[PDB]
């Protein structure tokens, strides 16, 4: 959310993402558009689970629809 992105900096490489089913952990990915996609569902993938992190790594894949409209 915004008030916790304006504090990430404004060129915040690393970011944390919240999945949609409770069965999945959170994923560590690096992007540079977080401050203009805060009203959209997105898609990510997974490349490697690393042990010096508590989370698994990923990378953005493609955009999805908008949170609020049926589509």
Contacts of 57 (CB under 8 A, 6+ apart): 27, 28, 29, 46, 47, 48, 49, 50
Min CB(8)–RNA separation in Å: 9
- Name the residues that contact RNA, by CB under 7 A: 13-16, 18-26, 28, 53-55
If the CB atoms of residues 55 and 60 are measured against RNA, the closer one turns out to be 55
If the CB atoms of residues 54 and 70 are measured against RNA, the closer one turns out to be 54
If the CB atoms of residues 4 and 39 are measured against RNA, the closer one turns out to be 4
Min CB(36)–RNA separation in Å: 19
Strands (E) in the chain, as ranges, are: 14-17, 27-30, 40-49, 56-66
């Amino acid at each position: 959310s915004k008030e916790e992105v304006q504090s990430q900096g404004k060129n915040a490489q690393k970011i944390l993402v919240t999945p949609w089913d409770y069965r999945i952990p959170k994923i560590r990915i690096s992007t540079q558009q977080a401050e203009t996609l805060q009203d959209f569902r997105v898609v990510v993938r997974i490349d490697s689970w690393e042990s010096t992190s508590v989370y698994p790594n990923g990378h953005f894949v493609r955009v999805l629809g908008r949170i609020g409209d049926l589509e």
